[PDB]
């Protein structure tokens, strides 16, 4: 139904192996490529979202819509009930339940610090946004465990993986 | 049919002690289920003494047939129904037949023997776990609740109690590595911390268990000479090196939650609540 900003893609003869979806190989397909275009056609990077960032964004947008619908005058159940559509209500309920029951960072400032650490770091300046989201989401504790769960980080050995993991564990609220 | 029933059952041939325990458990299960039938039979045929004893004997014989001799239900009903009915004579010496069981009861026998064969492995696993614990003093609660253990829920309660009160020992025995977080790590830290003596001083565990089992006061819970906040703060100040807590209120909350966990993992409270709910509970929607 909804159409992406990427169009064309007409017939050719060559066939490529970087077309199939694969998280391990970091092949996310054309619609999830590293380079995107906005409504103005300017350069844009793929925007991944960790569960903390996703939860913050969904809560902010939902509460903004709820405030707007009431003339600009917190509960997840009420917030889900704000939306229209029984199937939409169920889907947003399930997403909210997942995010709440696996929220590593429920505070805006903790998520901001985590994003700053995972973005401004010299080692992380090469890290793929999908890798960053996976690291902030799965909450791994060990370099070996992270490498096993994320095969992409195995080839990136120029990363201070263990100390970054310890920093994330520190930032994680016990 | 028996092969299909026993396909999931890896170990079927029980020992003689396990066999007798299975027979007793099956008899008790039938008595619980057929309580109305047994009561009506006893009330109507009150003249005959120990009709239910003959019922237990017949149930034991039927279990013997099905298990040892591998007899299907219709064969038993067509050629061994003499055991299933007790012919007594009244005051007039008229031969009166008493249908103690029906074919549906034989199907119930098969289902119950399968159920006990299933739970036998679980009870053996709990016994092996307890033996691996190798307690210096045999826990009276363990023995008391294991002797009366009939349902797998009670076995799970035993497992929870043993794991909670021997979390360090159970973790060591597991060690005797996937970094799974032990849910009892905080309680182990409390045990290692200097505030654990305060938790002892709240109430004696053995005295609490004796009082609860007796259902009446055998000992009086002695109140410590200083308030919980007083003792917590004093120990925190005198053991700042070892007290992992930050504030006295945090230690107070940790002590309260540890006491709550201790009370929750007590098998007797769970058993009493379960009996009360099963007896007098209601259903609301």
């Amino acid at each position: 139904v909804s159409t992406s900003t990427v169009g064309a893609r007409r017939r050719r003869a060559k066939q490529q192996v970087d077309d199939e979806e694969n998280a391990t190989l970091l092949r996310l397909g054309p619609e999830f490529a590293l380079k995107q275009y906005d409504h103005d056609g300017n350069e844009h990077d793929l925007i991944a979202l960790s569960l903390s960032e996703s939860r913050l964004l969904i809560r902010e947008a939902l509460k903004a819509r709820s405030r707007a619908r009431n003339g600009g005058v917190i509960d997840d159940d009420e917030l889900a009930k704000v939306t229209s559509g029984a199937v939409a209500n169920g889907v947003v309920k399930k997403t909210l339940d997942y995010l709440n029951t696996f929220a590593r960072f429920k505070d805006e400032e903790t998520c901001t610090a985590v994003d700053q650490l995972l973005h401004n770091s010299s080692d992380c300046s090469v890290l793929h946004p999908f890798e960053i989201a996976q690291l902030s989401s799965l909450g791994c504790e060990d370099v070996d465990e992270a490498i096993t769960l994320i095969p992409s980080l195995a080839a990136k050995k120029e990363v201070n993986l263990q100390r970054i993991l310890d920093e994330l564990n520190r930032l994680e609220d016990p | 049919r028996f092969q299909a029933y026993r396909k999931s059952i890896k170990n079927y041939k029980l020992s003689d002690v396990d066999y007798s325990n299975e027979r007793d458990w099956i008899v008790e299960q039938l008595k619980l289920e057929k309580r109305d039938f047994l009561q009506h039979l006893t009330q109507a045929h009150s003249s005959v003494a120990h009709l239910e004893e003959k019922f237990e004997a017949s149930v034991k014989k039927i279990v013997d047939f099905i298990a040892i001799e591998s007899f299907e239900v219709p064969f038993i009903w067509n050629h061994r129904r003499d055991y299933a009915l007790h012919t007594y004579n009244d005051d007039s010496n008229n031969t009166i037949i008493v249908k103690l069981l029906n074919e549906d009861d034989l199907w119930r026998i098969v289902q119950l023997d399968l159920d006990y064969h299933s739970i036998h492995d679980k009870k053996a696993a709990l016994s092996s776990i307890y033996k691996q614990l190798d307690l210096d003093v045999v826990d009276p609660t363990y023995e008391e609740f294991f002797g009366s253990a009939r349902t797998l829920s009670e076995l799970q309660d035993i497992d929870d109690y043993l794991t909670f009160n021997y979390s360090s020992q159970v973790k060591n025995l597991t060690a005797v590595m996937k970094r799974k977080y032990s849910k009892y790590a905080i309680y182990d830290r409390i045990r290692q911390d200097a505030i654990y003596p305060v938790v002892q001083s709240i109430a004696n565990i053995s005295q609490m268990r004796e009082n609860l089992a007796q259902s009446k006061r055998l000992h009086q819970v002695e109140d410590p000479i200083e308030s919980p906040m007083d003792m917590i703060a004093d120990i925190m100040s005198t053991e700042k090196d070892k007290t992992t807590f930050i504030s006295s209120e945090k230690a107070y909350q940790a002590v309260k939650q540890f006491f709550s966990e201790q009370l929750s993992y007590e098998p007797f409270i769970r058993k009493t609540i379960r009996t009360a709910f099963q007896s007098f509970g209601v259903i609301n929607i």
């Binding site: 992406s4 979202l49 964004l57 947008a61 903004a64 229209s84 997942y98 989401s137 | 739970i119």
Partner: protein, 171 residues
Amino acid sequence: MFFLKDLSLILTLHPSYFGPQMNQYLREKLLTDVEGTCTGQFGYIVTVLDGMNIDVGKGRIIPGSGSAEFEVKYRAVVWKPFKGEVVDAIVSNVSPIGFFADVGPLNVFVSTRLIPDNLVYNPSNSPPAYMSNDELITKGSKVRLKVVGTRTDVNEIYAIGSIKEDFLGAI
């Protein structure tokens, strides 16, 4: 995995709605028709950012049918699983053929052939579960699984998980 995407929708409006409240009505129609839907190409659209300030542009009158066609561009949060990805889950059902878990709106089915052998299914347990000596996974239990395959339907996505590798199973 969650993402931010710039999506576009074609909205057709009947002439009976050609009133002053046309723009707001288009906004709520877009919200009702996009929020919660499931497209195989993108996955699941969960929310639309800035839902009350979306530009709709000028609608074009379809020749011969009167209805106006609007091109609506918006930014939305989208979740889509990928092959070979390890994510958290909550078990929703236990069955002899396998157990069903839930990863947000997606329901994932894991067959016994993708489960470690020591986690023998126990139907006698209450509730029935796939349990081992040190592991017990039942309804409501947190599990870490790796998505192996995804099946595309008309408006649904079916994923298959596995716990047979390391750092998987119960968590």
